[PDB]
């Protein structure tokens, strides 16, 4: 079902300059925010503290605060150590969290990327380089794997704290999590590349949660030339998708954009091409190009 992600973006320009911004996602809803200039992690939901007590949370925050500055300096040193092997600028990405399951079952992970390539994970008890990782990493890993304190803290964040803290969120956010926002669909078109051909675009916007079916139709028959675009975010935590079909000019009459979604009950959104509403909405859209 759900996946918890703590996301860390660390950027090092030279010896003097660096910053670490973090974001936190349960499923596809952002739960936390940690800007470099803030000393404290900020909730982005009312229910962000999950089920943890004020001091339970503080324990966690204070641990993370220490980690941040500690990690910064540690990287800086790792550079000093890899004297010509690697050099600023350096970009580091962390992805750490949980996969939740039925149970009281749960799987945990901590992945590190370096310059945008996945290189190092944590696994069981130690740090490990992954297949295809640059072989010069072998040393720093050894140097870091000597720190049994860091290892035991990480083991606790991954094995216990994470699956605990997120079960906490799943309750505290249940309402927000399972919410239905109804999609809102509108047709348009542009001229296709090919002469005497048109491209018809069916806009779907404002839906939640993510699964959505969008197809162009001639009656019951699904038009196979339908191309779904990528899921694009709205800022109000809803989604936008568009499906474009390509056809000969004049072939549009009788075509319809069928939408299926969990928010709609059994009632599929069917937009026929030259509909009473298409005609009118398109009129509200005219522009000078």
């Amino acid at each position, epitope marked *: 079902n759900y996946t918890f992600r703590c996301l860390q973006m660390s950027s090092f320009a030279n010896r003097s300059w660096s910053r670490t911004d973090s974001v936190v996602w349960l499923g596809d809803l952002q739960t936390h925010r940690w800007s470099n200039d803030s000393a404290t992690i900020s909730f982005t939901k009312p229910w962000s503290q999950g089920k943890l007590s004020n001091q339970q949370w503080e324990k966690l925050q204070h641990m993370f605060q*220490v980690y941040r500055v500690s990690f910064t300096r540690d990287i800086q040193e*790792l550079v*000093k150590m890899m004297s010509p092997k690697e050099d600023y600028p350096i970009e580091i990405q962390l992805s750490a969290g949980c996969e939740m399951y039925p149970g009281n079952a749960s799987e945990s992970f901590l992945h590190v990327a370096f310059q945008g390539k996945y290189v190092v994970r944590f696994w069981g008890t130690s740090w490990q380089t992954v297949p295809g990782a640059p072989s010069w990493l072998d040393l720093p890993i*050894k*140097v*870091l794997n*000597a*720190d049994q304190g860091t290892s035991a803290t990480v083991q606790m964040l991954l094995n216990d704290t994470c699956p605990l803290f997120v079960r906490g969120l799943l309750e505290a956010g249940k309402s927000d999590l399972e919410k239905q926002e109804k999609p809102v669909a509108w047709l348009s078109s542009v001229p296709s590349s090919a002469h005497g051909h048109r491209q018809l675009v069916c806009h779907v916007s404002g839906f939640y949660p993510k699964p959505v079916w969008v197809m162009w139709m001639r009656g019951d028959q699904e038009q196979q030339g339908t191309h779904r675009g990528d899921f694009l975010p709205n800022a109000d935590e809803t989604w936008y998708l568009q499906a474009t079909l390509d056809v000969e000019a004049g072939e549009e009459a009788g075509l319809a954009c069928r939408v299926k979604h969990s928010s709609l009950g059994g009632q599929d959104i069917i937009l026929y091409w030259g509909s009473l509403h298409h005609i009118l909405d398109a009129q509200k859209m005219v522009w000078n190009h």
Partner: T-cell receptor
Amino acid sequence: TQVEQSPQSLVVRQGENSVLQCNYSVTPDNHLRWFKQDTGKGLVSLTVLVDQKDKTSNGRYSATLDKDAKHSTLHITATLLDDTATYICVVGDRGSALGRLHFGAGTQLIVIP
Amino acid sequence: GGIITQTPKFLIGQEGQKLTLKCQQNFNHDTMYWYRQDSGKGLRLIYYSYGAGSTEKGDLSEGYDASREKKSSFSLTVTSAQKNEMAVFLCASGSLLDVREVFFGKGTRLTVVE
């Protein structure tokens, strides 16, 4: 600094037990360790403490550390005339070789016959 | 199993003179340090290193430079000796896989005559 040792000078009778104190603020506090320095010489390692509440003992020396309290004590049992050299509390801030050492200003011991 | 040694034990220097002090180590230690002991202050790092010819500034690097010719060896240079200067210079080496594995030498005592 971030490591305060007390008192600045101790005086004890030979054969007596002497107690040396060290408080800190260094963070994280991976480990604390004690050093003996004879006049005009190097730093000799006495004992190394790691755990949240740790006790270690080498030879005469016995040392305890409370992390919660950010405090450490060094005991010398049956002090001898040798024990004259100054004593240095040092906190390390990483369990990796990346981490370094934060030095206390030291305590002179003066063993009277 | 072996020793870390600083030469010379004692050193006579004059105002504004350039001063060097070697430190050798056969522990196979990759990290090597140069501290300064000031009466009533405790050790302050001047220069460290992770091997030849890595040299990295510590909190007291101003007024000195250092050079690591080889694993076994680490030299510090005092650029301009102070007028009445008196200081002890201590050298330490360390394992990269054991934060703790740090061993010190027997110190170097500098007197600036005048």
